[PDB]
């Protein structure tokens with residue numbers, strides 16, 4: 001475990017401070033162990049300014065050394081802003097700045113269970129693949145076993161039947177494209193590279209294989225880049241109708257088809273962006289919002305109620321439950337579905353119906369506005385980067 | 391080999407979809423000239439599916455595509471076909487996604503030593519495919535010397551003669567891309583930096599591409615750049631593009647957002663455009679990206695890559711024998727120009743956003759079967775009607 005900091009500042013072209021500032025930068029770049037990256041870029045807010053980025057890694061939370069770097073800078077005549085990964089609140093929370101920074105997550109995975117010692121070497125084989133994966137790689141393909149493919153077949157066939165009557169129309173619209181273009185079929189588990197390629201061309205979303213569960217912060221921060229972290233292992237042979245883990249069945253049948261819908265793609269990113277630089281408390285509010293929308297969201301189509309939540313679409317059990325009066329439904333409001341508790345090992349007793357993904361996106365944008373944040377942020381699709389705005 | 395593409399839509403809940411799918415599966419299995427078939431959600435009509443069929447043939451205007459068409463309409467859809475052809479039987483083909491630029495790699499030194507060294511450097515851009523690292527060149531002592539002679543010479547003219555965008559970005563090239571009179575910067579390094587600035591990318595190029603291919607490349611913010619350097623004895627002016635020209639002339643402007651938008655706009659205009667419109671665009675390209683001037687208050691300065699990389703051109707433009715005009719694409723597009731001497735005539739632009747608008751207005755009349763648009767999120771060409 002390492003703790004990331006980031007220092008930001010600006011300087012005008014033709015400042016006679018620059019030469020001396022470069023000298024200081026060269027010096028720390030060579031003599032500071034914890035400096036990982038120093039970069040300068042055209043400023044994105046003032047035409048005449050340069051922006052400077054320093055990235056540090058420290059092995060301990062809150063290291064005094066960042067203070068020393070700050071003091072030294074603000075003495076070359078520069079005003080420095082510091083972002084840090086910390087449970088403490090001296091600095092605003094750190095975040096990844098460019099899409100390839102998501103590689104910094106590849107080691108941090110949080111999360112028993114169905115103990116069947118045979119699946120074990122798979123998981124390791126499968127999981128090692130994800131910690132080795134880095135941005136720009138093709139996602140490796142997995143020779144799935146007869147057993148696994150058949151688990152997929154059971155889950156797939158039970159699910160595809162309910163989709164017309166239970167799934168929101170974006171799912172039924174996209175799903176046959178997954179068959180035609182991504183090899184979706186009961187007789188074959190689809191490979192993440194193929195799906196990533198399909199999604200990029202639909203909405204610009206893409207996939208990274210993940211070892212397991214990331215922190216809430218890390219996972220939601222990824223969404224801000226339209227990047228979905230997905231697992232490649234499959235649920236145990238005998239849990240087809242409802243599992244705890246997020247197996248590829250949940251990822252491929254639950255999450256993937258909505259991400260090929262533009263509006264949902266935007267709504268999902270909006271949650272991501274909200275998480276960028278968000279406080280820990282707000283990250284928790286957001287993960288609750290994510291649960292009650294992306295994971296177990298309902299939609300209303302005319303007088304009908306149907307499901308878009310990945311947690312619902314991937315479970316033939318939950319598909320039965322939401323359509324009955326055995327659970328209550330409420331309108332989605334982020335300011336409401338935040339102080340709301342939920343079970344994770346049972347069917348949901350309470351769902352939220354979104355009016356549409358466009359309004360959900362707007363509703364989430366306002367939720368974000370309510371967050372104490374030291375700046376605004378904005379996504380740049382051309383540079384695939386986060387731009388900070390004061 | 392000549393590429394064709396077949397386009398058509400079909401609404402969700404069609405009677406024909408089932409059958410159509412079977413046929414598509416079959417000709418994919420049973421026609422070798424079929425490179426690719428894919429279907430996408432419609433960017434125009436919500437409940438519709440877009441289909442794309444890519445075909446590749448050895449001879450121009452193959453009769454086999456026409457058979458695919460009729461066979462495809464017996465199954466109940468109206469198809470629009472694009473083609474690489476010197477004829478206008480069909481509208482011109484274009485690459486549709488950035489990886490399709492892969493398809494383009496098919497296309498003063500009497501020194502035998504230099505001709506050898508060119509061959510080597512070249513036998514590498516022909517091997518590059520999208521998604522690769524751009525392989526680095528181990529430049530030569532002499533090559534590194536030539537660069538230094540050109541770099542240091544041009545370094546003293548930039549402050550007084552280049553437009554401000556150049557002076558603004560250059561020290562960032564020095565601080566991030568290793569620009570120096572002492573080493574030649576590598577395209578991979580350059581591409582990464584451009585990407586994080588304006589989303590522009592570099593592909594290495596083996597030689598000269600066609601106008602159409604090269605301009606089509608810009609619609610994806612992809613610049614094709616040579617890696618070889620000019621002969622030792624031609625540092626002041628060479629008629630051919632070399633790496634000094636790419637890196638000292640083209641690269642710095644490509645990091646300016648407004649210029650980057652402007653250049654992409656020219657490429658978008660070129661997507662699917664007729665041969666004679668490609669020609670107009672090509673000339674408009676020459677009088678802006680290559681040899682354009684800008685107005686900065688009382689003075690005229692250079693932003694064209696052809697000028698900025700040639701101390702000889704750089705000295706020329708500021709003199710009174712060289713005529714200066716306000717940039718107007720309807721005036722420029724028709725103007726002849728030399729490619730082996732200094733320019734007798736330059737066009738002066740007010741601002742890259744304006745030049746962008748003008749090019750869009752210019753292009754608006756261009757005849758095409760489809761409305762062309764770029765999606766930055768998906769990095770590809772959306773087609774509309």
Ligand SMILES: O=S(=O)(O)CCN1CCN(CCS(=O)(=O)O)CC1
Pocket residue numbers: 202203204261262263265266765767768
């Ligand atoms: O997925 S697609 O590529 O088809 C469309 C994605 N794109 C995302 C950004 N929104 C508006 C941004 S904002 O106006 O809310 O800032 C338009 C749609």
Ligand SMILES: O=S(=O)(O)CCN1CCN(CCS(=O)(=O)O)CC1
Pocket residue numbers: 380382383587588589646647648650651746
């Ligand atoms: O270069 S950067 O990636 O930094 C931002 C460039 N971005 C390109 C798209 N244009 C749309 C205006 S218009 O061309 O549609 O009028 C806004 C600026």
Ligand SMILES: C[C@H](O)[C@H](O)C1=Nc2c(nc(N)[nH]c2=O)NC1
Pocket residue numbers: 210212213214215216217219220229230231246287288290
């Ligand atoms: C999103 C919310 O924070 C939720 O607790 C999380 N879900 C996921 C996660 N990690 C992965 N890989 N997939 C999830 O769905 N970590 C956090």
Ligand SMILES: C[C@H](O)[C@H](O)C1=Nc2c(nc(N)[nH]c2=O)NC1
Pocket residue numbers: 595597598599600601602604605614615616631672675
């Ligand atoms: C862009 C315009 O069509 C011009 O004739 C071309 N320039 C170039 C080209 N090819 C390369 N490699 N570099 C150029 O600058 N072919 C066409």
Ligand SMILES: CCCC[C@H](N)C(=O)O
Pocket residue numbers: 241242243244245246250295310311312314315
């Ligand atoms: C965390 C996602 C929940 C997945 C869902 N419970 C299923 O049965 O697939």
Ligand SMILES: CCCC[C@H](N)C(=O)O
Pocket residue numbers: 626627628629630631632634635680696697699700703
């Ligand atoms: C079109 C490229 C022209 C090259 C330029 N005349 C130079 O010497 O760099």
Ligand SMILES: [Fe+3]
Pocket residue numbers: 246250254255295310311
């Ligand atoms: Fe999930």
Ligand SMILES: [Fe+3]
Pocket residue numbers: 631635640680695696
């Ligand atoms: Fe050029």
